[PDB]
Design a binder for this molecule. Structure first.
Ligand SMILES: CC(=O)N[C@@H]1[C@@H](O[C@H]2O[C@H](CO)[C@H](O[C@H]3O[C@H](CO[C@@H]4O[C@@H](C)[C@H](O)[C@@H](O)[C@H]4O)[C@@H](O)[C@H](O)[C@H]3O)[C@H](O[C@@H]3O[C@H](CO)[C@@H](O)[C@H](O)[C@H]3NC(C)=O)[C@H]2O)[C@H](O)[C@@H](CO[C@H]2O[C@H](CO)[C@@H](O)[C@H](O)[C@H]2O)O[C@@H]1O
Ligand SMILES: CC(=O)N[C@@H]1[C@@H](O[C@H]2O[C@H](CO)[C@H](O[C@H]3O[C@H](CO[C@@H]4O[C@@H](C)[C@H](O)[C@@H](O)[C@H]4O)[C@@H](O)[C@H](O)[C@H]3O)[C@H](O[C@@H]3O[C@H](CO)[C@@H](O)[C@H](O)[C@H]3NC(C)=O)[C@H]2O)[C@H](O)[C@@H](CO[C@H]2O[C@H](CO)[C@@H](O)[C@H](O)[C@H]2O)O[C@@H]1O
Ligand SMILES: CC(=O)N[C@@H]1[C@@H](O[C@H]2O[C@H](CO)[C@H](O[C@H]3O[C@H](CO[C@@H]4O[C@@H](C)[C@H](O)[C@@H](O)[C@H]4O)[C@@H](O)[C@H](O)[C@H]3O)[C@H](O[C@@H]3O[C@H](CO)[C@@H](O)[C@H](O)[C@H]3NC(C)=O)[C@H]2O)[C@H](O)[C@@H](CO[C@H]2O[C@H](CO)[C@@H](O)[C@H](O)[C@H]2O)O[C@@H]1O
Ligand code: NA
Ligand code: NA
Ligand code: NA
Ligand code: NA
Ligand code: NA
Ligand code: NA
Ligand code: NA
Ligand code: NA
Ligand code: NA
Lengths: 596, 596, 596
């Protein structure tokens, strides 16, 4: 009896009944202990003696044994205990070896991480993916991971190690072909990695989420090629209420917080600091296997960000046999700024970027039905390379309503680069243009329409303060065709501007172009006393359907017309009034209108 | 001693002190084991021998015994263990019997569901409510349920069984008259049910929530009368970050994700696919007992949906002695689409529906102070039955600002059906109208104002592309009175339209009607050289206060007036200029204006 | 052996191996029991006998012993068991004594509160802070608190006791200089306190959050000086999905739900009832030590509130050596109402308040780059003291887009009080003004511009119904300078108004003022048959650049001009048409325009 009690079966001989309730099960102590499981239950030597974790102990095989065993019973939750740091010091074996995997996750086996998991210097200068849900080296031949949740107040610490070579990959959690998996509460910190977490594989997976996690200092070297902290590669998945921070200079040039790469995905309520980019929203044709060729129902909302490059990047692309499409996107409620930096010191600052594909092509994209509403954006006055939208590839539609943009440019694309074909660009008059960059815009167009063509578009410019430094509010080079569009410049704060809207190819004459903008015009009258015509001296107004005075009349003896129409020779003409006769000559600020 | 140790009291004789700390309590093993409780502690036969769960074991009585016992100690949390499926195979007894109840919930007793709960085929073709918080067959005589939380990574599986008769009811969790209750993390799946979860009873309850749950395939037959996945029937309660999916055809015609039926309730951050409807926001007079006759502070925000019918349905109604009112509603940040379907194959597609009561009455409602802002809506081009708002019952106010609507109709109601009385309908010019349905609108009015009357309303139409197929942008039949309203049609993309705004009863003449829209007008001048009047040939412009040219003047020898007023006989009149004399005859596109 | 087994070391002699797995660690029962810890492990007398909690037992020393011990092992989670109420009955000692502290929190030691914690009447009429994370009486000399989480379904009950003196302070949780700390799930109730929770200290701290908590009835007496339920005094921190309720009359005059006082903080998805105020968003110079002098990236979104005073209060202030700045703020998606109350019975009702500092100064503030978008606000028709914005101190910018405001005033400041200097106030035309207060505005200006000066501002007034009671839509007293601004009043619903915009100092004449508004004007013509001038009888239109008719012409024999310009003497002049000669005299409603 004493022998049995002291044996490993001893708890199985000590009886227990819950709270002494006579109606409860007559169990043994070991049965109640068997209701929970921890790493300590597997962290032992071959004789079964517990081993203390630490920097000289490789915990990997013990944690794998625990996972494998719980998997064999239909699942459960393994605790990684608080008050200890559990080091990982070798690669895993089998199916995860193809992925540089350390631990293999298994279906229905959750990890409650309350302590700390650290990488040992075995991993210095090497690739690694700490937790891998694939079960095969070839993701296409992998089985699924289902019902796997990682959660707790604990920490995954990547040991500070730099990348050995840029071509290496490093990840925290790769769930694989992942269905109903999640990470909640965990701090990922102190690394040089490619991703912290990836969800799904090329569209295979569903209902994967990252919630209330922190990602701190996960890029630290010039070797690191690229970084996205969470990559969402399965539908019906997303990221909420997370915290992302970087301190490295390299992070400002390479790091993005989130990638949304399949339909019905979201990124919400998160705070970002120190990153180059906020989120990619992309349909890569190469990733369309599991959920189709369309990324739709994409949501970026209610985030807070200080970044150095672009907040949201939109794109789609093609392969030999598949074409990717991006539509039905909403970007709303986000408050974003470009952090303090020199002009041109990081990738071009933007709220929205329409980005060319990885080979630089701007003629592959199929992006449409995007709504950008109720956001704020700010860039400091010195940051020349700051835009509401950098529109650098073909765009099939994007709608801006009720945003507040306070940066150098509203719409921009660099000249002599890409020549996007633009359709359905809608800039509603309810977009408020801030004044931080007033006086900085010498030689620049606020809306610099450096496109191949623009159709079915609306640009309603409304200033909120003066900026007489700018060359124009909106300019179309002669190379940009413009048709079936509405372009207006409100007169407020424009009285002193030489140029308001500029059409370098006279494109505002087009049959289905609807415009209005202010201009100064010299007129001369006939000598007749009484009702008397005034005519413009210049003949460049053949396209004008009406014009009206924006100037007061300082004269007593006459008045110019209040409103004008045109004549076939391109003159404006209106009927004013000479109280006394005489030829009159005036210069008047007019609102020129065409079909509006 | 050996006897005591092996007895059910044995753990109560084995001493323990936490971590060997001399300052800690000298306890017994059983005391520490008694800190937790699971189903295994009650899942035993009359001799106390544990019973293994499975498809041939009815776990109901054991789970009820556990709940009842924990309730007797002031509460706690019962775990339903992982790695097992726990079948339910009989009805409960007592107070829950009136509700077809299986398990009775009790105050302060939480369920941590980590394993799976399944319904056995005893329930096939029968009604059932799996977990019931009422304690009486008659909800009016029921006590409350307080401080009851269901949570975990587990699953409630309804066994796939179809309904036996349409009149039956089936539910997952009915919390009853429920205060500070919640469901978090749970997957509900594989059923034909009426609701998954209901919160509160006829306004009695408070602080009930459904968070991070999944609802998958909960309608599967033509027998199922109706389905709402979560019904919120108590104030200060709501649904967040949930996932709802249906695959059944029947679901597309009957199923709604959420019902918000009392004040201060919300539905946020959720994803919906495969449902007919997104949310009801309703004050039923029949449900006003617990929290009053007003549903106010209703919030639907930041959701993602693919549906087949209507996204948000607003309503209120009356009984013999109570009148229900709906006000102070916000619908914002939602991105919604009508899924691919044939026209008229499901209930009429809409972003907002103002729905008549369950008896079809449209003259009972009191709905006002609703704000619909910053949403996107899309329906495929073939779906004739798609509208921003189907306004089918009396409306006392609804405000649209800064939405993007891309569907067949903006405002619609079917002719010869209901004749709503409409007040305070506000459609701000910042609503962007998409072009998906361009060329599909032969015989149709974009805003089809099929109402009894419209007052204190604003419709500011702004197109973003051409659609010459449409009969008109906005039309008022002669039966619709119109007063104290503003109706404008911006000219952009309208030059080629025969009809822009149409007032079949000439209602735009009303004293307090403020309108503007484009029209073509034939004018003739007098022969006089010099300043010369032009007059419209038609006499239907008695209501016009000013008009201005939207056309260029192709002539050299004359110009028509830039602006016009009217005359008592209904002609327009303006002063142009004949450089040379002669009678002139022109056809000009004008912007007609009345009091604007 | 029997002796050892019955001793406190007995569990340490009973062997256990998890699930009888031969590959698992050979442990002892005590090792598995040592994986968890509860208050029962420390709630014992000097002989180690467990003590039952209750109203006559002071649990404080036991809970402190537990915290101190777990702290010594590197942390963990202490459970406060369900089914018991644990009373606190004395003050703590040492470093927390300076803060009236009860319990001292320690780093890495979490509290899972499942039971109830109550204050004993020892605390009646006394100050207290229940849980304190400072370790020194002087916060400046305090160490940090890190990785401390309080969570569970339990309750902190403040015993109902009133404050003894107004100068006293009372708090639930003061995390101190707090990094990665949180409270989740907890109900705070039944008190008279200053705060429930405070996060950070004068900018020191990071990543602190309050989530899914309830705060119920935490002000109950006239002694209570002031109350903010959560004070956020560290960056990268915030409040989400919480519930706040008060029933006291005193709460309506003193209580605020949240204070956001450092950068990158948020308040989201919460419901508030019974409070005076929603949130302060403030940079106090006195609090700038830890995180700088700027509060930026401040987010208030998607909340539901019934309040009696002001929803969001903005401010910044200075000390002898530091100046505070507030910028980059977003207020969005909130649905707010002033509860039913008499006019002037609580602090002045407002959606936004620009508040003077604690000494009443209005010339210290530096508030700019604020976006207020997509919110709804309502106040009942009797509440004279209700405004979209009470602008009572210097403002450097605030932007309103696409809100729905339904209250007495849009912009207000009391005359003869403060004279704010206002820059960059932007009120977009997409703000919908509701009609609840129609007919109540005798003697009042809808936009009452009671400022020292206004510059670089935009006010675009758009009515949605008539209110002929109001004195004017917008009025500028002669003392308010106005320059480089745009002020427009849309004509809809204004035909019958005597005054629309009123410039008591004729400020609309300014060189860079852009205005338009309706006015009635008497004109007389010359007798000439044919094209004939009409001239205003009054000479106050020297500032007008154009005007156009808003009236029909009831005459056959003539027509007045459709459009007018001015003359140096301040007359308007236009060219109409006399079909038959004669002097004409008409009174016409015109749209007066200046530089627009
Ligand atoms: C860091 C990041 O996410 N960057 C974004 C771009 O991602 C693309 O480059 C990445 C570089 O790290 C990834 O490529 C690398 O990894 C591939 C996957 O590794 C293999 O497969 C894994 C499952 C195994 O575990 C590994 O062992 C390994 O075998 C590898 O094939 C590539 O050779 C390597 O360079 C990234 O690849 C994706 O990774 C995810 C997450 O792990 C995975 O689920 C996918 O299966 C895998 N996709 C593919 C196709 O393999 C790769 O996509 C990203 O392209 C870019 C988007 O912006 C550009 O394109 C837009 C659309 O045209 C355009 O609008 C925009 O302007 C462009 O800049 O954003 C980051 O740069
Ligand atoms: C499925 C659903 O929720 N449908 C919505 C409509 O709900 C209405 O019909 C339902 C059909 O299932 C419910 O009625 C059924 O259930 C009643 C309640 O069951 C009894 O009481 C329970 C507490 C017990 O546990 C049960 O054992 C049983 O005794 C029953 O009385 C009815 O006879 C039966 O048909 C639904 O009833 C509500 O259910 C909730 C949740 O359980 C409960 O808290 C309420 O007490 C109960 N209410 C009432 C009055 O009994 C019933 O409301 C819903 O009416 C509709 C809203 O849209 C329409 O009305 C709008 C406002 O006028 C109008 O704008 C719109 O256009 C209309 O279509 O939406 C779904 O159809
Ligand atoms: C209840 C509340 O939060 N009210 C808001 C105002 O807060 C200011 O008054 C409070 C009154 O309770 C606090 O002052 C009180 O407490 C101070 C702190 O206590 C000391 O330090 C603690 C760390 C210890 O634990 C305590 O033992 C004690 O030693 C004390 O010094 C004061 O004497 C006392 O009156 C509040 O003080 C802040 O408290 C937080 C949270 O505990 C703490 O983190 C800070 O360190 C501490 N700050 C300071 C400077 O000490 C104090 O700030 C708040 O000023 C106001 C904002 O609105 C006004 O100002 C705006 C900006 O100019 C203006 O726009 C607006 O119109 C104004 O009305 O809002 C509430 O009234
Ligand atoms: Na690989
Ligand atoms: Na769009
Ligand atoms: Na071109
Ligand atoms: Na019933
Ligand atoms: Na409204
Ligand atoms: Na009628
Ligand atoms: Na103190
Ligand atoms: Na702003
Ligand atoms: Na002044």
């Amino acid at each position: 009896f004493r022998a049995i009690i002291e044996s490993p079966e001893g708890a199985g001989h000590v009886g227990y009944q819950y709270r002494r309730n006579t109606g409860s099960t007559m169990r043994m102590v070991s049965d109640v202990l068997d209701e929970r499981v921890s790493l300590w239950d597997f962290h032992c030597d071959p004789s079964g003696n517990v081993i203390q974790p630490g920097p000289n102990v490789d915990s990997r095989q013990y944690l794998q044994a625990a996972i494998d065993y719980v998997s064999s019973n239909g699942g459960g939750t393994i605790t990684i205990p608080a008050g200890y740091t559990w080091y990982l010091g070798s690669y895993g074996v089998g199916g995860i070896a193809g992925h540089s995997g350390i631990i293999q996750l298994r279906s229905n086996v959750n990890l409650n991480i309350e302590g700390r998991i650290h990488l040992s210097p075995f991993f210095d200068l090497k690739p690694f993916q700490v937790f891998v849900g694939f079960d095969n080296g070839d993701p296409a031949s992998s089985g699924n991971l289902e019902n796997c949740h990682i959660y707790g107040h604990g920490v995954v610490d990547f040991g500070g190690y730099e990348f050995g070579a840029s071509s290496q990959l490093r990840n925290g959690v790769a769930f694989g072909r992942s269905y109903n998996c999640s990470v909640t509460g965990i701090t990922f910190q102190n690394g040089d990695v490619t991703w912290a977490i990836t969800l799904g594989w090329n569209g295979y997976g569903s209902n994967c989420y990252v919630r209330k996690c922190r990602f701190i200092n996960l890029v630290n070297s010039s070797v690191n090629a690229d970084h996205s902290t969470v990559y969402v590669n399965c539908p019906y998945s997303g990221v909420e209420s997370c915290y992302f921070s970087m301190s490295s200079s390299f992070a400002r040039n390479i790091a993005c917080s989130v990638a949304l790469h399949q339909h019905d995905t979201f990124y919400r309520g998160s705070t970002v600091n120190g990153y180059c980019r906020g989120a990619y929203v992309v349909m890569h044709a190469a990733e369309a296997a599991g959920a189709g060729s369309y990324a739709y129902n994409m949501q970026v909302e209610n985030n807070i960000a200080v970044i150095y490059g672009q907040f949201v990047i939109l794109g789609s692309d093609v392969t030999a046999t598949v074409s990717g499409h991006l539509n039905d996107v909403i970007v709303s409620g986000n408050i974003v700024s470009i952090g303090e930096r020199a002009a041109f010191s990081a990738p071009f600052g933007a709220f929205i970027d329409i980005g060319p594909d990885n080979s630089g092509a701007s003629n592959v994209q199929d992006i449409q039905r995007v709504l950008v509403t109720g956001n704020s954006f700010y860039a400091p006055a010195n940051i020349t390379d700051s835009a509401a939208i950098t529109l650098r590839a073909n765009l099939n539609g994007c709608t801006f309503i009720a945003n507040n943009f306070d940066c150098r440019y509203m719409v921009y694309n660099a000249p002599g680069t890409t020549s996007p074909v633009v359709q359905n660009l809608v800039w509603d008059k309810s977009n408020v243009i801030g004044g931080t960059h007033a006086n900085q815009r010498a030689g620049q167009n606020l809306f610099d329409m450096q496109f191949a063509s623009v159709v079915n578009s609306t640009i309603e410019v409304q200033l909120s303060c003066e900026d007489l430094s700018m060359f124009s509010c909106i300019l179309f080079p002669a190379s940009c065709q413009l048709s079936y569009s509405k372009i207006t410049v409100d007169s407020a704060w424009t009285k002193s501007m030489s140029n308001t809207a500029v059409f370098e190819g006279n494109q505002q004459a087009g049959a289905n172009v609807y415009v209005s903008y202010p201009a100064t015009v010299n007129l001369t009258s006939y000598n007749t006393q009484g009702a008397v015509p005034f005519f413009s001296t210049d003949t460049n107004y053949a396209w004008v359907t009406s014009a009206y005075s924006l100037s007061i009349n300082e004269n007593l003896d006459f008045s110019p017309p209040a409103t004008y129409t045109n004549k076939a020779n391109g003159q404006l003409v209106g009927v004013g009034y000479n109280e006394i006769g005489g030829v009159r000559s005036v210069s008047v600020r007019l609102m020129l209108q065409r079909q509006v």
